[PDB]
């Protein structure tokens, strides 16, 4: 359970708090895990299309 | 039930379908005769499931009715919080 | 009742932050901090303050 | 071997939970039925055991 | 998720005793569960002359 | 008990409240009518707890009275010390 919630400890540690950009949830520009252009085949419960 | 009269499949068929123990679907068929078919199937759907809901009435003599199920109004909620019975008990009333 | 105060704090703090405070930048390696970049560098003078 | 260190190393019982649920040859069909007695949003099956 | 959402009526980071860097340490320090405790204890020594 | 007369909620209500295991709150409410509310709430719990303390009443044919639990005078203390009972036994007297 909590080392992929220590993976919560391992995809918001090694970057960054101080400066962000252009209004999409967060700091969204992002990259390939965390912003506002990944919804999907996601066809289970409810949030993303 | 009467008169329609009895599902032999055939494509009549009749919406309920008020049986228990359809040792009937097969049974024989054997096979379906010369009609168009498509629904057909619907008639078996709705009324077979009715044949389920009305097949009950009972089994409620040992339930254990339904519950508040959750935390939500529950039109008072202002003098006690709400919590739901997830039914780990063996619901029998013995 | 310690609840309305928290709500008020949340509402005020939603826009209290037009930029980001310089005091969670505890992360930089020695050299990132050291380079004459860092705006907090000119405020790190006495090791006991 | 350079991203995870002491997010640490392993042993018999949980990647136990690993070798015999993703390799060889032995699977089902009617809890197939029961998985669509399962599939995703809330539902009132939220009440029994 | 940026700054510890600590209400101003309970003390701020720059006026408190336990500040951001030690929290950074405990959430990013990475050895063990004994060495971590002893290191943290080593943290709590005054810098008064 | 009478006449006040019986908790319907409403906001009358009354302080005792001498019922047990009430499936009354939920129950219908349904919901509270057009009156002010505030306490209500305090008067509710203040009686509910009493109606459980008074609900005990019996169950005391199985106790096993209470004790000093900890150690303290005990106005004698001059020819024997004092100790308490860590209430870990099953009080049933059967």
Judge whether C3 is closer than 8 Å to chain E, CB to CB: no
Tokens of B92: 């029998």
Q: Do B67 and D47 touch (CB under 8 A)?
A: yes
**To one decimal place, what's the resolution in Å?**
3.1
A-chain residue closest to E30, CA distance: A9
Q: Do E28 and A13 touch (CB under 8 A)?
A: yes
Tokens of D32: 């197939």
**In which residue are the tokens 């919560």 written?**
A8
Q: Do chains B and C touch (3 or more CB pairs under 8 A)?
A: no
A34 contacts A11 by C-beta, under 8 angstroms:
yes
**Which of E3, E9, E47 lies nearest to residue C5, judging by beta carbons?**
E9
Q: HSE-up of B7 (CA within 13 Å, CB side)?
A: 23
Chain B residues inside the 8 Å CB shell of D49? 86-89
In whole angstroms, what is the distance from residue D41 CA to residue A46 CA?
8
Q: Which of A17, A20, A21, A27 to mutate to test the interface with C (most CBs of C within 10 A)?
A: A17
D46 contacts B70 by C-beta, under 8 angstroms:
yes
In whole angstroms, what is the distance from residue E35 CA to residue E32 CA?
6
Q: Do F32 and B68 touch (CB under 8 A)?
A: no
Cα distance from N-terminal residue to C-terminal residue, chain D: 44
Judge whether D7 is closer than 8 Å to chain A, CB to CB: yes
Q: Which of F36, F35, F33 is nearest to F8 (CA)?
A: F33
Contacts of residues A11-16 at CB distance under 8 Å and 24 or more positions apart, as own/partner, are A12/E1, A13/E28
Q: Note which residues in 2-41 of chain D have CB less than 8 A from chain E.
A: 5-7
DSSP track, B6-71? ---SSS---S----S--TTSSS------SS--SSSHHHHHHHHHHHHHHHHS-STTT-------SS
Q: Do A6 and D41 touch (CB under 8 A)?
A: no
Residue E40 region by backbone torsions, left for phi larger than 0, else alpha for psi between -120 and 50, else beta: alpha
DSSP 8-state code for residue C47? T
D-chain residue closest to B64, CA distance: D48
Query: What Cα–Cα distance (Å) separates residue A10 from each residue in A33, C25, D4?
Result: 12, 18, 10
Query: What Cα–Cα distance (Å) separates residue C40 from each residue in C28, C49, E13?
Result: 12, 13, 16
Burial of B17 (0-12, 13-18, 19+ CB in 10 A): buried
In whole angstroms, what is the distance from residue B25 CA to residue B19 CA?
12
B80 contacts F25 by C-beta, under 8 angstroms:
yes
State the SS3 of chain F: CCCCCCCCCCCCCCCCCCCCCCCCCCCCCCCCCCCCCCCCHHHHHHHHHHHHHHHHCCCCCCCCCCCCCCCCCCCCCCCCCCCCCCCCCCCCCC
Judge whether C20 is closer than 8 Å to chain A, CB to CB: yes
Q: How many CB atoms lie within 10 A of CB D33?
A: 9
Angle at B70 between CA B67 and CA B72, to 5 degrees: 120
Phi/psi of residue F85, nearest 5 degrees? -115, 110
Smallest CA–CA separation between B45 and chain F, in Å? 36
Q: Do C24 and A19 touch (CB under 8 A)?
A: no
Q: Which of B78, B74, C4 is nearest to F37 (CA)?
A: B78
Q: Do A17 and C20 touch (CB under 8 A)?
A: yes
Distance of alpha carbon B76 from the chain centroid? 33
Resolved by? cryo-EM
In whole angstroms, what is the distance from residue A47 CA to residue A38 CA?
11
**In which residue are the tokens 């044919």 written?**
F61
Tokens of F85: 């009972």
- Beta carbon pairs, A and E, within 8 Å: 5
Q: Which of B94, B89, B90, B18 is nearest to B56 (CA)?
A: B18
F41 contacts B79 by C-beta, under 8 angstroms:
yes
Tokens of C33: 């901090």
Cβ-proximal residues to F39 (8 Å cutoff; 6+ apart), any chain: none
A-chain residue closest to D39, CA distance: A44
Tokens of F84: 């308490």
Cβ-proximal residues to F92 (8 Å cutoff; 6+ apart), any chain: F62, F64
Cβ-proximal residues to B32 (8 Å cutoff; 6+ apart), any chain: B9, B10, B11
Q: Is the alpha carbon torsion for B64, B66, B69, B72 positive or negative?
A: negative
**Which of F25, F31, F40 lies nearest to residue B80, judging by beta carbons?**
F25
């Amino acid at each position: 359970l909590q080392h992929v919630r220590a993976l919560r400890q391992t995809i918001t540690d090694f970057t960054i708090q101080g400066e962000g950009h252009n209004g999409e949830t967060s700091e969204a520009l992002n990259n390939i895990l965390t912003d506002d252009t990944f919804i999907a085949p996601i066809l289970w419960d409810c949030d993303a299309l | 039930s009467n008169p329609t009269t009895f599902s032999v499949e055939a494509i009549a068929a009749y919406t309920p379908v008020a049986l228990i123990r359809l040792l009937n679907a097969s049974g024989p068929l054997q096979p379906g005769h010369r009609v168009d078919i498509a629904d057909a199937r619907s008639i078996y759907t709705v009324g077979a499931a009715a044949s389920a809901a009305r097949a009950r009435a009972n089994h409620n003599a040992n339930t254990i009715r339904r519950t508040a199920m959750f935390a939500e109004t529950d039109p008072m909620t202002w003098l006690r919080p709400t919590v739901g019975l997830r039914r780990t008990f063996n619901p029998r009333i013995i | 009742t310690l609840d309305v105060q928290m709500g008020r704090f949340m509402e005020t703090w939603a826009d209290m932050m037009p930029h980001h405070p310089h005091w969670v930048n505890e992360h930089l390696t020695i050299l990132q901090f050291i380079a004459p970049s860092n705006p907090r560098l000119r405020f790190e003078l006495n090791p006991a303050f | 071997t350079q991203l995870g260190l002491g997010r640490h190393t392993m042993t018999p019982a949980t990647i136990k939970a690993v070798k015999d649920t993703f390799e060889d040859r032995a699977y089902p069909t009617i809890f197939y039925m029961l998985e669509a007695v399962i599939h995703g949003n809330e539902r009132n099956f939220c009440a029994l055991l | 998720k940026m700054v510890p959402p600590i209400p101003p009526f309970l003390g701020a980071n720059h006026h408190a005793t336990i500040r951001q860097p030690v929290a950074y340490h405990v959430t990013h320090s990475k050895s063990d569960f004994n060495t971590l405790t002893y290191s943290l204890l080593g943290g709590y020594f005054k810098f008064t002359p």
